[PDB]
């Protein structure tokens, strides 16, 4: 019956969301830090909040936890997503400069498109 209530969980998630580079991975200085940077009425509640807060970083440093963005996980993510490969995936260099479409695509570009380097593949059953 050690399930934490939503009061502990929402406060601990709110603490990590804005105070990641101040808390460590041990409960002793985490409960010491929560006395100044947070206002908790009872000693039993702040021990439960700091205990769950330390438990949350027992897996945050293990891997990215869904639903928590702690001001450190953000800026390496909008650093990562501008993946510009040095070569394209649609420029015909791993091929011989010619894309190997089938017969039905050849008269498609013959009817409406302009002349391009194509091949003919006998695709069937």
């Amino acid at each position: 019956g050690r399930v934490r209530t939503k009061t502990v969980k929402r406060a601990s998630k709110a603490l990590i969301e804005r105070y990641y580079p101040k808390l460590t991975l041990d409960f002793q200085t985490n409960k010491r830090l929560c006395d100044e940077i947070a206002t908790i009425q009872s000693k039993r509640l702040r021990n439960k909040i700091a205990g769950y807060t330390t438990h949350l970083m027992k897996r945050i440093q293990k891997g990215p936890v869904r639903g928590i963005s702690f001001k450190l996980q953000e800026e390496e993510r909008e650093r990562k997503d501008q993946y510009v490969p040095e070569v394209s995936a649609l420029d015909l260099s791993r091929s011989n400069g010619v894309l190997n479409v089938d017969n039905q695509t050849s008269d498609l570009v013959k009817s409406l498109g302009l002349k391009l380097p194509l091949s003919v593949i006998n695709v069937s059953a």
């Binding site: 009061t7 603490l15 804005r18 105070y19 940077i37 947070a38 908790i40 009425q41």
Partner: protein, 65 residues
Amino acid sequence: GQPVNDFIDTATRHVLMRQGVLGIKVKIMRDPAKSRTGPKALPDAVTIIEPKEEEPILAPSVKDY
């Protein structure tokens, strides 16, 4: 629980009408923010002090006097 003793106040009054007696029960809670003595918030209320942002480089050097 204990917040009922702190913030909740009650009064019971018997009025006398023609048909009999009507009972009046009034329950009022004041918000704990205006409380002068005792706790100033609910026991399950947690407030987070907003942190102050800092710039990353901070120009490594020494200043003397």
